[PDB]
Amino acid sequence: ADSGCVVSKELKCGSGIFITDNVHTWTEQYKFQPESPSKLASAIQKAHEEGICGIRSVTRLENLMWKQITPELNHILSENEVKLTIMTGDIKGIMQAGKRSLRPQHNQTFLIDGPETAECPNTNRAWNSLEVEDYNIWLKLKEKQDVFCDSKLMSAAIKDNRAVHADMGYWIESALNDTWKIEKASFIEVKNCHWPKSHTLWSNGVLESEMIIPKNLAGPVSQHNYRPGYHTQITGPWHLGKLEMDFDFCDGTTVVVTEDCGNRGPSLRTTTASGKLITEWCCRSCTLPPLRYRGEDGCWYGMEIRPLKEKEENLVNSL
Amino acid sequence: DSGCVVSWKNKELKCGSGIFITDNVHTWTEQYKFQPESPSKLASAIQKAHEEGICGIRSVTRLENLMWKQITPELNHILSENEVKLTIMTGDIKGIMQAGKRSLRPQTFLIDGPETAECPNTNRAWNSLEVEDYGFGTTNIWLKLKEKQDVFCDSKLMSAAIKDNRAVHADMGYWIESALNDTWKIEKASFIEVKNCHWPKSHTLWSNGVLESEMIIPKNLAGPVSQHNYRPGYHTQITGPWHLGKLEMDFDFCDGTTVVVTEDCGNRGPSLRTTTASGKLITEWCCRSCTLPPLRYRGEDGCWYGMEIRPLKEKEENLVNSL
Numbered sequence A: 001a002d003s004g005c006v007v008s009k010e011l012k013c014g015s016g017i018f019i020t021d022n023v024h025t026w027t028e029q030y031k032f033q034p035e036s037p038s039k040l041a042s043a044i045q046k047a048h049e050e051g052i053c054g055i056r057s058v059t060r061l062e063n064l065m066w067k068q069i070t071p072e073l074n075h076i077l078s079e080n081e082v083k084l085t086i087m088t089g090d091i092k093g094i095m096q097a098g099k100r101s102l103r104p105q106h107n108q109t110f111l112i113d114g115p116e117t118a119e120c121p122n123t124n125r126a127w128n129s130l131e132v133e134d135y136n137i138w139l140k141l142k143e144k145q146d147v148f149c150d151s152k153l154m155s156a157a158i159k160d161n162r163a164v165h166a167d168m169g170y171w172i173e174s175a176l177n178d179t180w181k182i183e184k185a186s187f188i189e190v191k192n193c194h195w196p197k198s199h200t201l202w203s204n205g206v207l208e209s210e211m212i213i214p215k216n217l218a219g220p221v222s223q224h225n226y227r228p229g230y231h232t233q234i235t236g237p238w239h240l241g242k243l244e245m246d247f248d249f250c251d252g253t254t255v256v257v258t259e260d261c262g263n264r265g266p267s268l269r270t271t272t273a274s275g276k277l278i279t280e281w282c283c284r285s286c287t288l289p290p291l292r293y294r295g296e297d298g299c300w301y302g303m304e305i306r307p308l309k310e311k312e313e314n315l316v317n318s319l
Numbered sequence B: 001d002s003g004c005v006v007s008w009k010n011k012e013l014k015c016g017s018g019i020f021i022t023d024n025v026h027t028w029t030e031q032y033k034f035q036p037e038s039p040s041k042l043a044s045a046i047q048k049a050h051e052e053g054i055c056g057i058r059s060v061t062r063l064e065n066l067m068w069k070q071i072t073p074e075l076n077h078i079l080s081e082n083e084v085k086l087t088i089m090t091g092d093i094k095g096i097m098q099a100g101k102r103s104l105r106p107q108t109f110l111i112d113g114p115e116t117a118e119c120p121n122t123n124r125a126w127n128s129l130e131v132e133d134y135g136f137g138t139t140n141i142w143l144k145l146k147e148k149q150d151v152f153c154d155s156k157l158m159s160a161a162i163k164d165n166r167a168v169h170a171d172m173g174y175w176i177e178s179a180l181n182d183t184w185k186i187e188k189a190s191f192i193e194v195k196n197c198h199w200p201k202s203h204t205l206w207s208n209g210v211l212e213s214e215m216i217i218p219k220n221l222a223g224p225v226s227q228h229n230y231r232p233g234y235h236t237q238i239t240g241p242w243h244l245g246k247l248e249m250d251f252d253f254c255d256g257t258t259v260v261v262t263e264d265c266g267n268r269g270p271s272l273r274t275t276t277a278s279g280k281l282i283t284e285w286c287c288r289s290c291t292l293p294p295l296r297y298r299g300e301d302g303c304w305y306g307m308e309i310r311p312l313k314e315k316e317e318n319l320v321n322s323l
């Protein structure tokens, strides 16, 4: 067990389990490391032999690993005198999943991450094929090609009417004010894996048509992932990659509830592409305070929120 | 909520923000104490309930009973001073804290104590108190009356967490550890109390597709409805030694006993103790489909085995079981 001391203005000490937030920390405390870059390289040789253009990362740290290891891998690949050039790209927005998966055991090109292409489909990319051995993190090959995120990375906790589902890239908070409902969400990444129900709190009788964070977007199948007058934000501003969902009004905007408002569609931003600000918003059934997203390009509103009088075409949505 | 914690086994410590769950069970000091909001209102509720025709009430948890014992004379004092002739009497608690079919809402009176015929549990009040706020310091806690009736344990006392493939469901008298060795399963369970409420789903992990026949710790014993409450080859231990009240159950053999897996072994029945009423020690045990290390209960009178586990040779009627 983990024995120590923590302070909230109350002080408490003892033994138990401590769940940390590594998302909001400006410092990068964790890095990913391989146990056998040789085995990895061989698995990539096999993958290319098994017909694979490249691989797509599940998380940000995996991508950073692929980046920091690519030269050595290519070097190793050259050390084995096997003709292949490994190319690692960047991650942006939702990390799309790959249907292929690695198996443990002029020049060609192996495309790790990067943007989409016609030469290499997502179905030819490998994904979710690296798990954690132990803790800098000793990683390794997986059992099989499950569409779940790594269990050793997931975490969760609940006490004093505050529930948290946490990850190395996610930080999801719900609370009990009259009822249990989602409160906050923090994202460094957006991934296409599924949140394991082993590390999930309150998973019984969960309507997937109501869970805000999408299941196929590592959304916890939980009644904590619930918010009255909301549904799954399938078409939300997840194209940001890094964002902060909360339940308040965007700065300088006003949202009201009315039947006169339109139907739910792709999330929109307060700021026009031209820079024009809209202050008047509406929802047909949403529950004030409204679902908002804080990111790079500014604030966005939930799918349920549409502008009152302004035409939707004038705005920017999830493309 | 920021702080620093150190793991000896992991040989690693960490600082930062987040959420800390504390094992209130293996605390050397009884840090917590139950205290009401307005004892006068409690007394009022007692008078009203007695007038309704109630005979007594039953605590839900240990520290609740402690509060009752800590405020009874003051309560009985309030009664007389506020014009009424009711004698409130509180006995101790042993084993399972039987629920009461009735409840509180905002000739003598009996609280807890032994089971009696004058005041059956069907006419007892139970699960009528909830916490509003926490005191600080010893650490005390407020209590007020519930506006709703249920058999759920107070949500504000339960906790849960998962990290490093080790789940924990905690309480003030419960501490239930699960882990991932090969597969996910329950590893330990610590009790200072045995209650009959229900462990709510809001504070539960993996509550999907949970066979109550597979949940080791019974649902009606505040057992977490979870696949963290599972064990390969074991079922709901309804006839475990829950008469002990305080116990520490886990998975290892009893000291100087032998358990094996044999289809010839007897079927599952009441949990037996390794030692008989005379004092003999049953060294040979078995199970049909159970898995080793065996489900054992470390209590006061010694080590016990799971329901699936039977004495290999010795007639089970020569052994002591949960009556």
Ligand SMILES: *[C@@H]1O[C@H](CO)[C@@H](O)[C@H](O)[C@H]1NC(C)=O
Residues within 6 Å of the ligand: A177, A178
């Ligand atoms: C809790 O919800 C009520 C309405 O349901 C609201 O009036 C109150 O402000 C909320 N408490 C908060 C936000 O702390």
Ligand SMILES: *[C@@H]1O[C@H](CO)[C@@H](O)[C@H](O)[C@H]1NC(C)=O
Residues within 6 Å of the ligand: B181, B182
């Ligand atoms: C997991 O189970 C195996 C089965 O024999 C055992 O050898 C091992 O020690 C167990 N691991 C832990 C951490 O208890």
